[PDB]
Symmetry: C4
């Protein structure tokens, strides 16, 4: 919700609010994530049984309360002193998976100890052995999926951060402590874990197909929130094509700009299994810590149920069968 | 007309003007109703006989003076002290059907006693028997059609109203005194009345077809003025597809954003039998009571005749055969 | 040119500037005339012989210096005291046809006496005999074509004029001194003159075809400058379709929003034989009388030649064979 | 980069900043060059080997460091006292071809003596012999290609310059010291040089094909930065069609609005061999002379490499095989 964004702008130092809000380049891809969702209209169905509307899904072996997970966002102590623990606690209590980052400001084992349904996001290290160590650590700690970020051979050029000369406060560190990943890297991860491997940052149809062929359990259709290639298509504009191409071969998630339950409904109707949400979770953390994130997740939960029922869907499956029109 | 909107803003308390003007969510569907009409252009015909231009139609057994009816709008005493009686009187005198609401602030029997061509809008009650009682009451009072609202399994989230903490003044009540409706509910209504049943809030083509199959006498292609699902397609964007699918099997009405006789002409040219008009009627009621609504209906009548003749149509039938271009 | 518009706003009384600038309704069709031209892009050709670029055309038996004529605009004494005589003189000297109006503020015989290539615009009178008298007068005076306006069964609702309570100054009159025209009216005119009859205000393809069948020598594809049906498609959006349908059976002119030589080039490339120009001619008349109109026509002549040659066209015929892309 | 534009506005006299920034007419084609690029989105590829990303290309017999050359811009002493020598030096040092203009404010032999990879832009003179002299001079001086400008049968109408009454300062001259070029002119140039002839200002597909047939070694798909025909399509909107039509028969360059490495990537993905960059180079020259241009070229080099790798391309060839989506 947009209320939370203003609250976060008030509390955070400007340069940190910019690290959070910004995109790469001219921010064309950042803006397009929103434009893309705004142009999607749902064709709701009427007069269906709504006696037992449920927003639950099963994904990567487990039930989730909503078709949504908290996206990986590095260094969450930048936003609140409890950082990742505040968010992970709120996510647990909401029944939403939480993605622990490779660049988390609290150790992955500490965040996993919170409980809930933790996933682990991997950045490939120069050193196949350390990469595979991180994976093994995550698995030993009870993470349920490996979200391999594949869109960051190196970081995008964030002009806000360069303009600010933004740097990590010395009170924030990479508590778990890089090279471009390839398909060979994916295979090394797949061969070393029994957890589902989910490739995050896929936009081309042939890469979605190859992800299935590679043994991925999922993909996240994503332009990294407009922070990587400036001019990369929004994931929501590729999603329907990608869902058709994989034809049920893996879960297909999407992110970028999801700001309401209606947006979740749009993504579902375009064929997404679930969405990730990034910036809004951080606005809520900045504004009110754990209880802020809890309130955000409850509002999203309400909005998703509302939208589903208004659209005649008693389940997320039904929402996936909704048609859309581009406006 | 837009003159009336400003007049109403001046006279009404802010929170009531917001209950009236607002949509759900981000108001995306509210804005899109207008955008959709603005992008439609008519291809007028020339050099046709206009000696006897008539705006009359026959609908649900009766003549109407224009291809238009007053939409159901709950609690019209919110806008003027004479509420529904002022509007119903003006509608009668203009030869326009008036839709009496389930949530009317004057009793349905009182409004029907005004005369004219009253229709009755139904909200389904938890309790098939009370629902069917309302229907029987309406029929006994001389209502000519049952407008079953099928897009409100529960109310949309109106953020204006939540922000205002808007509530009914204790001087406005539901003078006729809820559960999600299904297709079984439609059948129960159809089996209990000889009046045409008109399903209001249809947007999917397959729901329009099923409405015909269900024995509806009409549908209203509608996103509830942008007040229900935020992100629901505008009815005007579905209308041509829907008209083709039903292929004369029931009357096909449309609403949402109709603000002029030219807009009526656009809807007709897209295949609508008639339109509903909501907010403008309430602006006129707020501004000048019965005579306000009369002046609005006379202006609309003038604008419809003007537009028709400019477009070479001596009858509404001819207007339906006009072609359009999207701009 | 836009310089002239400001100059005219300065000199004219507000209500007269509004009679000139305004459209009907919400001015949707007025704005769309401009939008339509702005979205058209020309694909220029290179490396062609331009040794003898000519902007001349033959139309309705006679040479014209440019593919352009002055549109019919009633009551030109509203804008300058010399009214129609100032404009007709400038047009003559530029080699541009001038359309004398039925509602001219100087008599048709006086304006024709100026010389040049006068056409005569007809409004159909209640009274076939008086209509045919006007036609005969025009023909006896040496007018070369009858421009039958077919888009005014009655006048559009000009809200600017209603708001101003605009009325003709008693010093402006209809110096030549109404009913809806039909196809029978066209035939009566065609049977009573040997001059080419040009139907002005055609937008539907089937009306363009029927115009040919009816023996018209031309049509003007036009929404009457956005002053008749509000929501009528711009002529420029129908032109290519219309040109294809008539397949050389009559001349096909266009008007609405032409504001430069580049706009003339766009219209030509879409298949127009020539354009009409209305409002700009009146801005020039208001600003500087006869010499104002002369300067406007010389600027347009320069701009047309410039655009043609830049686009590799040594003749208007070649310009008609240019391709376009919609942006 | 946009930083440089403001810096240049500060330092340059207004009328010179306008000679540089302006387009012809209403500047519709100038704006459309930017719009066109902004609507192009790239579909990046992931997980490819990026161990040796190279931005180098071979063109017209020689290696270039980037798929980019400095566009021909007349009279560069207008912007800085070192004019063309400052730019040519920076280009040399960056490994970017520099296009020497026929209307250069330093002699072509002086600029060629700088070294690097100089090309020579030709304007056709009234006098085939002088034209061919210029060509021979360029060839004798070591220029590697002849960029024949074919979109200037005469200059466009630059309203900024007419409004300013802009004229060359007497301290700027055409140091190398006109008629419309035709296909016969192209042949005369082709027959008189062994250098590749590159036709600059092609927009029609059939002109691109005829350029190949004529023995051109390249074309530049271009609307001359919006300075020639106002309303000419942007080159970027024709590029994909043109690349398909020539089917490898010559190099296909593009210009107009390229303002970042991401823009270069878009052009490549649409099929361009390379781009030209005009205005930005002049902003950098105005702001900081030779070192300004060097800094611009290093920033562009960084941005091109960044974008390529983010998009999974280890070479420009790979970038050409990227797909795009129009937004
Ligand atoms: C401050 C910030 C940090 C991020 N850090 C990471 C990261 O460490 N790993 C990752 O895969 N994605 C990262 N992302 C991208 C998000 O996972 C997600 O793709 C993007 O934020 C989704 O868009 P949304 O923020 O619009 O909801 C980050 C995003 C932001 C805004
Ligand atoms: C204040 C308000 C109250 C409404 N109440 C009802 C209602 O009780 N029943 C119903 O079916 N629709 C209701 N509607 C929706 C209208 O019938 C209609 O679909 C919508 O207003 C049409 O759009 P328009 O207002 O843009 O003309 C209401 C609309 C407004 C603005
Ligand atoms: C003040 C005014 C008066 C007009 N009078 C007439 C008229 O008497 N007869 C006619 O056929 N068209 C008339 N028109 C329409 C023009 O002939 C022409 O279709 C329209 O002005 C073309 O558009 P433009 O003004 O954008 O160039 C008039 C237009 C204006 C602005
Ligand atoms: C001030 C100026 C002068 C120019 N002079 C020439 C010229 O002498 N020869 C030529 O072929 N193009 C000329 N051009 C056009 C450029 O070569 C190029 O096509 C255009 O600038 C590319 O667009 P960009 O400026 O947006 O990068 C000129 C452009 C500008 C802005
Ligand atoms: C992936 C993520 C991002 O900001 O996109 C990131 C944040 C900080 C440092 C490295 C990467
Ligand atoms: C005009 C409207 C819009 O884009 O607001 C629209 C919605 C759905 C499909 C087409 C157009
Ligand atoms: C259907 C209608 C509405 O506002 O959409 C309504 C108004 C007041 C209370 C309930 C429903
Ligand atoms: C450009 C114009 C508009 O959208 O204003 C248009 C009207 C009808 C069809 C296409 C375009
Ligand atoms: C046709 C023309 C017009 O304004 O469109 C007109 C002007 C004055 C009076 C009648 C008609
Ligand atoms: C993007 C550009 C525009 O509309 O400015 C365009 C010109 C011609 C064709 C398509 C797009
Ligand atoms: C081609 C170029 C231009 O400005 O487009 C030019 C600049 C000055 C003088 C002549 C031509
Ligand atoms: C909505 C978005 C945009 O134009 O910003 C888009 C990007 C690529 C393709 C279609 C739409």
């Amino acid at each position: 919700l947009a209320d939370l964004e203003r609250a976060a702008r008030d509390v955070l130092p400007g340069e940190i609010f910019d690290f959070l809000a910004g995109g790469s380049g001219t921010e064309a891809s950042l803006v397009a994530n929103r434009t893309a969702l705004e142009r999607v209209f749902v064709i709701p169905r009427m007069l269906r049984d709504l006696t037992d509307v449920t927003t639950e899904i099963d994904i990567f072996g487990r039930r989730a309360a909503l078709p949504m997970a908290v996206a990986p966002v590095a260094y969450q102590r930048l936003f609140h002193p409890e950082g990742e623990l505040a968010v992970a606690r709120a996510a647990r209590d909401a029944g939403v998976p939480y993605t622990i980052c490779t660049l988390s400001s609290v150790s992955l084992e500490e965040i996993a100890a919170v409980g809930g349904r933790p996933w682990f996001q991997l950045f490939w290290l120069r050193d196949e052995k350390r990469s595979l160590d991180l994976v093994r650590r995550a698995e030993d700690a009870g993470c349920e999926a490996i979200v391999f970020t594949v869109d960051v051979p190196w970081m995008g050029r964030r002009l806000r951060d360069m303009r600010n000369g933004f740097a990590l406060p010395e009170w924030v560190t990479a508590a778990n402590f890089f090279a471009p990943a390839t398909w060979e890297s994916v295979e090394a991860v797949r061969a070393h874990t029994d957890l589902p491997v989910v490739l995050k940052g896929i936009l081309a149809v042939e890469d979605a197909r190859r992800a299935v062929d590679a043994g991925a359990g999922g993909i996240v259709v994503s332009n990294h929130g407009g922070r990587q290639l400036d001019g990369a298509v929004p994931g929501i504009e590729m999603l329907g094509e990608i869902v058709a191409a994989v034809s049920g071969g893996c879960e297909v998630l999407v992110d970028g700009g999801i700001r309401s339950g209606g947006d979740v409904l749009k993504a579902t109707a375009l064929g997404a299994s679930a969405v990730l949400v990034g910036r809004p979770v951080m606005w809520a953390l900045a504004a009110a810590g754990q209880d802020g994130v809890r309130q955000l997740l409850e509002l999203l939960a309400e909005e998703v149920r509302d939208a589903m029922g208004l659209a005649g869907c008693e389940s997320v499956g039904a929402a996936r069968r909704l048609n859309t029109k581009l406006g």
